[PDB]
Every structure is written in structure tokens, then in C-alpha cells.
Amino acid sequence: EDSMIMNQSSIDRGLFRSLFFRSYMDQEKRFGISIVEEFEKPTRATTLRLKHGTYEKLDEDGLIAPGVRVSGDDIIIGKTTPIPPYHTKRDASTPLRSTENGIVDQVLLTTNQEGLKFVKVRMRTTKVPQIGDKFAS
Amino acid sequence: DPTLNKTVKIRQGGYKGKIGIVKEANGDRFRVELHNPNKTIPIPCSF
Amino acid sequence: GVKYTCGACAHNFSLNKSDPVRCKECGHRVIYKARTKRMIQFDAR
Amino acid sequence: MNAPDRFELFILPDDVPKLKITPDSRVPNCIIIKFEREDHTLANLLREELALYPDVTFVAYKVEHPLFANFVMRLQTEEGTRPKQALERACASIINKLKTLDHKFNEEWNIKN
Amino acid sequence: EPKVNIINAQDDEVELMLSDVNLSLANSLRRTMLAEVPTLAIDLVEIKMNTSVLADEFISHRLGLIPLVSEDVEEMKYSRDCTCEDYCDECSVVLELSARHEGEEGTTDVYSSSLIKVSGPGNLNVGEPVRRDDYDQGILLCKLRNHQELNIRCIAKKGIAKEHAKWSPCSAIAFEYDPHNKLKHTDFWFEVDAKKEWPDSKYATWEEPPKPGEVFDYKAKPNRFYMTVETTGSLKANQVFSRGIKTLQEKLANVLFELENSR
Amino acid sequence: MIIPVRCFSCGKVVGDKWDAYLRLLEEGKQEGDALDELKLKRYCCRRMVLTHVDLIEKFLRYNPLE
Amino acid sequence: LMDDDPVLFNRQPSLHKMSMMAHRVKVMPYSTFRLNLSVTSPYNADFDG
RNA sequence: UCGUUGUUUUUUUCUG
Ligand SMILES: [Mg+2]
Ligand SMILES: [Zn+2]
Ligand SMILES: [Zn+2]
Ligand SMILES: [Zn+2]
Secondary structure, eight states: OOOOOOOHHHHHTTSSOBOOEEEEEEEOOOSSSSOOOEEOOOOTTTEESOOSSBOTTOOTTSSOOTTOEEOTTBBOOOEEEEOOOOOOEEEOOOBOOTTOOEEEEEEEEEEOTTSSEEEEEEEEOOBOOOTTOOOOO | OOOOSOBOOOOSSTTTTOOEEEEEOSSSOEEEEETTTTEEEEEOTTO | OEEEEESSSOOOOEEOSOSOSSOTTTOOSEEEEOOOSSOOOBOOO | OOOOOSTTTTSOOTTSOSOEEEEOTTSTTEEEEEOOSOOHHHHHHHHHHHHHSTTEEEEEEEOOOTTSOOOEEEEEEOTTSOHHHHHHHHHHHHHHHHHHHHHHHHHHHHHHO | OOEEEEEEEOSSEEEEEEESSOHHHHHHHHHHHHHSOOEEEEEEEEEEEEOSSSOHHHHHHHHHTSOEEETTGGGSOOTTTOOSSSOOSSSOEEEEEOOBOOSSSOOEEEEGGGOEEOOOSTTSSEEEEOOSSSSOOOOEEEEEOTTOBEEEEEEEEEEOTTTOGGGOOBSOOOOOBOTTOTTOOOOOOOSSOSTTTSOOOTTGGGSOOOOTTOOOOSSOOOOEEOOEEEBOSSSOHHHHHHHHHHHHHHHHHHHHHHHHHTO | OOOOSBOSSSOOBOTTHHHHHHHHHHTTOOHHHHHHHTTOOSHHHHHHHHTOOOOHHHHHTSOOOO | OOTTOEEEEEOSSOOSGGGEEEEEOOOOSSSOOOOOGGGHHHHTOOSOO
8 A cells, every 4th residue: 555665775775865954043132222132151040941951062152063962952052131120131042843853063153134143053964764754756 | 960961981781882971860870862873872870 | 262264264263252253364254163172973874 | 763773683682581482282292482583584494494304293483573573483293202302303403404514515615716 | 415516606706506405494594694694894983073075974874884804703702792891902993094185176085995904803804994906996985175184083893784784795695496497486477478588597508498298296396596695895705605604503503502491 | 976885775885886987988988888897787786887976076166164 | 651552543534433443552663653454444544644 | 949931923835
């Protein structure tokens, strides 16, 4: 009933094996001339409502360096928004999708149209053909 | 246990000689994700 | 202390999170974080 | 994600024996062998040998499910011999056959080169 | 009783005739050769630095597949069960490669040859990547342009093809018997006739054709198999043959030991 | 993208044969002849040398980041 | 969810009451539900995705 | 020191 048996050794030799690229986009948001949003690693004491994941892979500058490994529920970007009135900072992180895993490949950092810091993260991983996949002649 | 989130290797078992990082350390059984595949595995604190 | 790289000149440098985000040598406006020093492994499978 | 490890196919875990034997009550002098970490490569070879013996009444096996690497072998010899004796006899005979084949092939290759 | 008759031999391949043995025996031999003949291949790649246009996993995979001279691998213990914390030099071999293109032009071609054994349980003849000839550069690993560098530190281990196809020493094992179908194990699909549409096997000469008036024989059994063997070069064909035989023998010995020890 | 290492189907090494295949091609020999001289009989392999598209050289044409 | 547990099982759209029955669970590896080829008929289902 | 929360609204191209 339109289901097909594929040689396992063909897979092991890399048959139909494929790459996979995912990009995450974020930027600083200016909530005021004196009030803006910053990229950085938050501290539990100085911030509230932190994500259940872990931030350890974050750098001191608020980003994650390429060539490191990531996984689901892993905070790849640390952004903190000032709380409108210490302990006046709230998270604005960009956790990786809980159902995806890969290796951080290339981080792009620049300024948006408005001069605010502008970031992009591209994770990559390989998708091994397996049971349940789809193929068609 | 303040010894979490530090890279750890394995010495005995089926995954001997593989790198990894502790994820959960409830006690007596560490779940360290493997860097080579996209999987996590448990292993006691002795290995 | 964080290493960086440009997209045209490709000359490394670093920032202290305070310098405006531009290339120090050719003034370009695009930069990438350089590869980390930690080790990478693969099953080669 | 839910893929089974490739090293689990042949490295038998300690808690489970390589081979498990059971009796078959429905008929006399019949046993059921539960193998582990094996496939047709061994089962078929053993079956072909055991079928040739005269004192073996019923020899059979089946790879229950390919996603699990093990097979079960049903063997019943006539009352004269207990099945286990026939099994070990077959194993020894096959080992001897293989040794003879190796000797002959070594000779042939040596003269060939 | 079993007989062998090698027809054409060579370092990488063998075309032999094996007769007077159960079809099960020959087929199990083929399977064991294809599957359970331990050899040595790369099993951990650490990229200390890469700048090529190829994903790290891509290069790791390509490395995994390169054939290694695994002649004495029989003498290397399984890293899984080796007692040493981490990997000793007796449960693993370490290969290192680092090639870099320089100059604004041209394109370097990192070849398998560039791999260089660093350690290994010497003087065991294992680890060196296989080469067709003296000058054969070997496999093509990657291409590098200006200002592109590659630094990897591979690892190899002894594993069976069951775990992964990279440990397979046999390329393709031909197999056949009764080229004239005298046993009638097959019925030949045909539009007009079975003979004038079906090409004959290349061994048709080696056996007499069935006579026209001959009657079917029902007690006849397959008796002659015409199996060819090839290897990647990681092991000599004859060594592969002997090693598969040894593996089958010792597995059966293990089974017998378990049976007797059940009591 | 780059010539494969082994023939998915069987396993015979083919990767190293790409350069020789090209070389034989430049001097006018038809593809069938080139494959024959390389001793590629089982078409399970021949399909690869015959029908590989080389893309890495296209990738190189981009000035590297570094 | 251990072996032998009874679990409902449905396919959308569920035209007629045979379009959803209760099966017995048997945990297996890999990431696809598996069925006996016969019981597709009522589900009007095929393994093409 | 357990605890521990993450948008709507449309439109779109898709799957059976
Ligand atoms: Mg359908
Ligand atoms: Zn620049
Ligand atoms: Zn060791
Ligand atoms: Zn092939």
C-alpha cells in the first residue's frame, strides 16, 4: 500500500542524506530615546521571568558563538527589556524550538535601518532518511 | 550539586570516549547529551 | 574580548559592547562572530 | 529520535542470557530455544544441518520481528535422543566442516599463488 | 567432504567454485563475510578548525567511509570493553590531517593520502589508508581555495559492518548455482520461449546442458555454487574468506559453550 | 556536490576515480569507454561516475568569508 | 503507556463508526504508528503519508 | 527554596 523498503546500507553510505538550515532573527527594540532594549546575558537576580532552559551557552555579549552545540529549550539569544518603574529588567530571549537540534553555524551581527543592533543566528543539522519519511518518483 | 553545565566525558560503557555536557544531575544518574548525534543518554555518576 | 570578522576585508577584531557596530579597518557594517575555541566531535557516521 | 542504537543489535546486554531454552509441553521431547542478538545468518545454517539428521523429527524457527534482532527455534527429536544433544552434535559437525573447508581453501590458494 | 576450486584470484577479489556443501552453508558464509568481519574505520573526528565550503558533518561522514588497512585488526581489542579510561593505544588508532591551501589563486585538493598515522598499537600493520598503487593519491576529500585551512584529528576503532556500513570489507559478493535451472527452482517468464529470450549465465559452459529426453530428477539438490568476492582493499580477499570462516566458527563455539553451560 | 566515496548500492570505492574519469574524457574517449577502462562493470557503480553533477567548484567561485 | 493498554485510534475524517476503534498498545522504536495491513480498509487509509 | 509563566489577529502556500 505505497510503502517502500530501502536498503539500510544505502543510507549508511549517505543515500538521500540532506542538510538543514534554520535562521533566527531578532533585534533591539527602542522603547524610548532614553529607554531601549539591549543584547546581553541576564542574571537571575537582576531579571525576572527567565526561561526554563539554560543560558550557559550564551557569551558575555548576549549571543552564542558558532561551532557550539545547541538543543531544544536552549536560549540562543539573551535579550533583556527594562521594566518601566533595582531588578528592573525582564527577559526577551529567543529560545530554540523545543523540537529541533543542531550546531550553531554562523552568527550575523549588524545594525538595522534604525541603527539598533541587529542579529541573526543560523543553526544547521543533517536529516538522516529513516522510517516514516516520504519519497516519490 | 553546583557541578552542572560542565563538559564531561565517559570512560566505560557503549559510549566510551565521547564528549558531552551535563544537563540534569538529580542524583546518582547524570543525563549528558551527546555532541555527535542529536540524542541524550543517562549514565551513573561513576562513569 | 569577543572575536569578530568582517564580510569584505575579513580582518578580525573585537568590541566591548560599546563601540558602534562597524568594521574597524574598512568601516563595513556587517560582522560575524568567529568560531569558538571549544572542541567539536562527530561520529563521522 | 526514536531510532534504536546500532550497537544494540549484537552486543548482548548482561541481564539477558545469550540463549534461553524452554520445554514444549504439547508434545514430548520438544523444546523451544529463545536466541538473542542473532538472525538468519546463524539460524538458517543450524536448521539446514539439523534437518539432515535422521533422529530429528521437527526443527523450525522464525525471526519474529525484524526490528528486534533475535529468533526462536523449535526442535523436537524422537525419543531416542534429547534435542539438546542433537543441537550440540550439529554445532560440532558444522565446526568440523568449516575447519575442513578452511584447510582446503588455504591449500588451494597456496598452490594458486 | 567440502571442496573448493579457485578459478581466478587476485589481491582484491576472488572468483572461486565451492561445491558439496549445503546451500545454507554458502549463503551464511556470504552473509557473514558481508556483515560480521571486523575491520577498522574512522569513528571520531575532531575539527580543530575548518574554513572549507563543506559542512563539518559532511567531511566527518566522508572520512568515515575511507578504507583503512585493517590487516591485523584481529589483534585489537574492542574499545567498548577495553579497560583503559578513555582510549589507550591498544583499543584505537589516531590519525591526523591538516592541509592548507596558500596563495591567492589555485585550488588545493585534500586527498586521502594526506592522512597520517600518529599513534597506534605498533608495530601492528593497521591504520594506514589503503592505496591502489605507489602514486595513487587516493580518495578526494575536499577542495580548498585561497585562505582556506582544515585541521582535523580523526580516530579509528574496530567495528563490524552490522553497526554501520563503513565497517563492511566486502564490496559485492556474486552468487549462483544450477545455471541450467536443472533443479527447477525458478520458472522463466517468457513471451515465446524460455530459451531464446533469456541470456545464459556466464557459467553455462561449466556444466553440461540437460539432455532433451532427460526426465526431471526430484532427489537432486544444489551442489555447486559459483561465488565471487571483492574487497575495498582494506583486507585481502583470502584473508576475508578465512576471517569470515573463523568468525562463524567461533560464534558457533560460543553457542555450544552456552548450551553446555546452561546446566 | 562532490564525488561520493562509495557506491551506495554495493560499496565499491569510486571517489578516487573521478580525476581519472575526467582525464579520459578530455582526450575524446566516449563515456562508456572511460567507464570500462576504470573497470566499472556493475552498473550500480557506473550510474554514479556517469551521472554525478559537480558543484563544489561552483561554490569555490565565491570569495571566502575569511 | 505500557504494553497491552487499550487506546482509542482515529483517522480524520471519521465518516462512520468503524473510522475509529480501540487497539492494544505495543511499544516499538522509531517514530511511526504501525497497523496491521488489514485494518486499513475501515480507516480508508494508505501509508502514503 | 519549592514555585515558575509566553499574544492575538488576519492572510497565504501546503498535507490526507
Ligand atoms: Mg492517504
Ligand atoms: Zn572589514
Ligand atoms: Zn584501550
Ligand atoms: Zn556499485
